[PDB]
Amino acid sequence: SETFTRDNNMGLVKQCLSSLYKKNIQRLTKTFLTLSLQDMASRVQLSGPQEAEKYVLHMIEDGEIFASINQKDGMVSFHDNPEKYNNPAMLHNIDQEMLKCIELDERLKAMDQEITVNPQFVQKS
Amino acid sequence: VENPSLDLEQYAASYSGLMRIERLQFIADHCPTLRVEALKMALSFVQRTFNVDMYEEIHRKLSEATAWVEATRKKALLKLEKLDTDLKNYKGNSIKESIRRGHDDLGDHYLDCGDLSNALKCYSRARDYCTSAKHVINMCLNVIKVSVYLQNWSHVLSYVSKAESTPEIAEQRGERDSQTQAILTKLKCAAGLAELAARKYKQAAKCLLLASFDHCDFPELLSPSNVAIYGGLCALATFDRQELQRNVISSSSFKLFLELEPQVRDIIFKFYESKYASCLKMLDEMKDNLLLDMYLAPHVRTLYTQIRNRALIQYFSPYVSADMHRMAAAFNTTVAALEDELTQLILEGLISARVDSHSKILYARDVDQRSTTFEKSLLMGKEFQRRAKAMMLRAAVLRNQIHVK
Amino acid sequence: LVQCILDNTIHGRIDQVNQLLELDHQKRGGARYTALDKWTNQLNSLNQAVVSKLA
Description:
The structure is cut from a larger assembly and holds chains A, B and C.
Chain A: H1 2-6, H2 12-28, E1 32-36, H3 37-43, H4 49-62, E2 67-70, E3 75-78, H5 88-116
Antiparallel strand pairs in A: 1-3, 2-3
Helix pairs in contact in A: 3-4
Chain B: H1 8-12, H2 19-27, H3 35-42, H4 55-65, H5 68-76, H6 79-82, H7 85-93, H8 96-113, H9 116-126, H10 133-149, H11 154-165, H12 168-171, H13 184-197, H14 201-209, H15 227-238, H16 241-249, H17 252-260, H18 262-272, H19 276-290, H20 300-316, E1 319-323, H21 324-330, H22 335-348, E2 353-356, E3 361-364, H23 369-399
Antiparallel strand pairs in B: 1-3, 2-3
Helix pairs in contact in B: 8-9, 10-11, 10-13, 13-14, 14-15, 15-18, 15-20, 18-19, 19-20, 21-22
Chain C: H1 2-6, E1 12-15, E2 20-23, H2 31-51
Antiparallel strand pairs in C: 1-2
PDB class: signaling protein
Keywords: COP9, COP9 signalosome, signalosome, deneddylation, N8CUL1, CSN5i-3, othosteric molecular glue, signaling protein
Entry title: Cryo-EM structure of CSN-N8CUL1 in complex with CSN5i-3
């Protein structure tokens, strides 16, 4: 504690503790379709089904996880269906990344054209 | 851990020769009520094996934990000087044939008394004095047999590969299929023992299945009774279904070995027939006995884990959705305990499935190739763009000559 | 059915909870995505080589 507070980065380390719980919950999605809140809290050491419900709900709100909460049975179901890559919005995302690569290529080509016209260059080549 | 189910009638007939006494080193720790009986046979056993410095070891071990006898040890020490007389005559003759012929017969003798260091050094210097093709064949058996006793394999592996390739692959035809003593069966058993101790179970099984029972009756290298155990356990843990059927079930050479031990034969067959509740039960009973095997004790835990893991993968292979209640029963475990086992398998990537812990059903997962391809390609583009923009900034700091003094 | 599936003589899977055998009349010519996977993997190593050519 003294080392981290001396370096003034207190809070970043506490964010590592909270992110470990999120990382453990995200690992549950790689193995489970439906997990009880009590059972999940015992694997991620959240000490309570109520705490697990709040932790999972926050992840859904932030978009970190794809899951739903069922209070009738006290179960959490993981819906691993991010996107089908069929909507026209995916086309818009593709051309946004393509434009970034094109602009990157234009700068790369322009800066080597400055090298070719350099009097210092072609003298040593 | 008492095991009264061990049939002493079968076990006494399983080992023969020197391997009986070596097993008792560990067994006698927790098997009382036979010390008086052992003394009865000790009258004809003290003279046996030419024990000189082993006698002091046995009596001191139990005494430190929890003179008619001493007379025998003192008298036997004088016989050590007599054997040295025969060695002088060979050197005086100065004949290569006389030394070479008597060396091979004398070489086996130092092994019995206990001069391991002296015996090994002879073959190293005698290699340059051997130029004939026959002399090459004989020394291969001797060096491997001795090296097994002192438990080394770095030298054995070096000579094994060279001997099979340097002389035009065993002299082409094999010199009339070797001599009367077929060495081809002997190197196969030796290679299996060497590879098994090297934490290579797959190679040990391959070198053990290629053996013929008619020429596999040597009570000096390894007992034939446990040859089937070694070749079955290693093959079960490593070989897949295609390899197991072709190399074990359909192998006529290995069927003779399986007749010796019906338990290992039934375990392999039950595994093939998708009968895991019965197969694992027999393995559990046999597990304690295998722990007393000198060449199999350290590999029992890993072999059993691999066999069970292979059974779990094979069980779920023909299912797109499997009930966890039936699956747990087939593996002699509870649903909760089996769920933990499947969690590690799925995380490791050996099983592509997800566990529905509401109705206790294991659902096979079908990945989408199109979605997976798109997400990994976009991830590659994002990483490439970040890398390119980072290095194009590096070109600025390199061109501008920016550094910390 | 389990023996046939394990022997690759029957191409299908068993739905135990419904007592079903769903066959494999699927898996069309999706080798285009497999080719795109190799293209992406080769490109991933290519960027690192160009950026890290000498220093």
